[PDB]
Amino acid sequence: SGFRKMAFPSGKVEGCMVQVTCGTTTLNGLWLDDTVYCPRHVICTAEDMLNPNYEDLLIRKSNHSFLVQAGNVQLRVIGHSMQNCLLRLKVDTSNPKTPKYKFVRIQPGQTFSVLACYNGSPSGVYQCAMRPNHTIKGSFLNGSCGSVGFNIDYDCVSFCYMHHMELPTGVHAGTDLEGKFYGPFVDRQTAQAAGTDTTITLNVLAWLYAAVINGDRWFLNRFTTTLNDFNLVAMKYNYEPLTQDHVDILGPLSAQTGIAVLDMCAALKELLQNGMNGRTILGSTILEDEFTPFDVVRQCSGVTFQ
Amino acid sequence: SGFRKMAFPSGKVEGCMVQVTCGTTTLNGLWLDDTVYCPRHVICTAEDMLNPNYEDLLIRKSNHSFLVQAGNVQLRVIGHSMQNCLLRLKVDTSNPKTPKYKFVRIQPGQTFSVLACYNGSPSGVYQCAMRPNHTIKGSFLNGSCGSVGFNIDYDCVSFCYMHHMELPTGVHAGTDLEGKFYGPFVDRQTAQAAGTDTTITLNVLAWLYAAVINGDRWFLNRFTTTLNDFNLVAMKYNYEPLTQDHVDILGPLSAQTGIAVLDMCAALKELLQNGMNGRTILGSTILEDEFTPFDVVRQCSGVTFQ
Ligand SMILES: *[C@](O)(C(=O)NCc1ccccc1)[C@H](C[C@@H]1CCNC1=O)NC(=O)[C@H](CC1CC1)NC(=O)/C=C/c1ccccc1
């Protein structure tokens, strides 16, 4: 038993991190087969950043404008193109540690593990959720650009995030592995603000099911609710509206616990209206929204402590 | 910026996990050079566990009583001995992925990363602290025995924990890599209870320094306190007494922020006495005690957001 924000084991990703330098700018890149992926702003200098024209800035570089280092070893660049907000650098050597992989664009509310990296050297690993406002609450310092997010399913690594920027509120923004930003953000050193955020309702509910699987029932009640009545309370507490598709996703957890979804919604509504009255759930005093239903099934026992 | 419970990158440890089977019992083991380490209860059957005599149970096995699997590959055992609560199995092949390593016994209040493992296959990674009562708040299911805890410093892995049991309250207990238990616990399927726990004072203070490094000052105040006056309030809130050595450990953080330790103690005392008044610190509504001063220096910027 127990319940923790767990990340995926990071080994397969560690063996793909490199350093990419252009001029005075060093950041991290990702070496799969004979391509290295990195944020396109590696080509920029201080001056360029308020208002860069990347097409203009890039045509002025050659292959040898880029230095790629994998550990001790210099990799020779032999090709370069820009794909949305990344560069793809062709190199002379195929990464022998390339895992089986794919690139996915993850959806708001989904979770992934981040491998924080500095100078191509992995520093730490942690789990986070893509927020509804398309940011992540990471932990990232100067040098972290190019750090990747990922999920692992059955020895296949699904890359989903590359790091690019920190916003004024201290949260983080970046792209998928085709270089398309998550959210309305752009890679310029300008003023941009996160949109207003909301609590991820589906995940809160999934975590309450986890608390029940792990043997705690205190917050349950004898009521039920309709969706719609649930949703009027949700809006007032800045929770995402729940939908029938979300109700259906909770099926498996519902069956493992014998608690119908709308019954767990009445439980949630009562917690939003009355507080937790100094009690905890899975050790927390707050309602947690950074575990998906999938995260719950993966970590919790397949048998309820009834 | 940002602040997260971060674990060490897990790659070096992943390449050392194996499966160890004896009779009907399968659990995980740790393969360094030509030794495999595992919990000694792998030799036990259901029957044996209420009251095992391991010396008696072990003399009745041979080398071939043990099956070791590294991925697809069977490793041949050629030697066996018991060291406290572990077995050391000599094998015919030296692990080619053996990292640079050491074995340490960690102290109460220190932190490490756990690589949760099932059937020799790594499943997840998370950070936790050795509690003052010598337990950890892990997340561990059937099959997790043999999962290891570790720290990484400068490409050297310091193993410090191997997993053995879950207590009735849902927290976890095990040994260092010489097989000595943390705490008063024994490897028998009997009734044992965690001793009463306390909050780790030094870590709470270190995390308040992190909140200041990251630019938040709201909880500060104009007071100071003596140690002793601090400690009378500590005892009443089930906090560990603070000592002069702990005050000295906080030196570097104190200097980076310009906040004297006893001034941060007055801040803490005021938070214990008055609450947080619906406010948060580093995103939390609770006082966090699972970051050491070292964890703070490692993750936070070396320059304060003043
Ligand atoms: C990455 O570019 C990065 O790490 N680059 C390498 C590097 C940077 C600085 C010194 C040495 C090496 C930056 C990562 C940021 C920095 C702080 N934490 C992070 O996550 N990214 C940026 O600096 C980024 C570049 C922009 C093109 C996209 N800009 C910002 O993060 C801007 C922040 C900002 C601007 C204005 C007001 C408030 C915040």
Ligand SMILES: *[C@](O)(C(=O)NCc1ccccc1)[C@H](C[C@@H]1CCNC1=O)NC(=O)[C@H](CC1CC1)NC(=O)/C=C/c1ccccc1
């Ligand atoms: C490990 O032994 C383990 O994983 N073994 C492999 C295995 C076990 C069961 C099925 C299939 C494979 C156990 C890990 C525990 C199980 C639940 N979560 C864990 O952390 N450890 C034990 O079962 C352990 C063995 C004892 C010799 C030390 N016992 C306990 O954990 C006992 C718990 C208990 C007993 C009585 C009351 C309440 C709790």
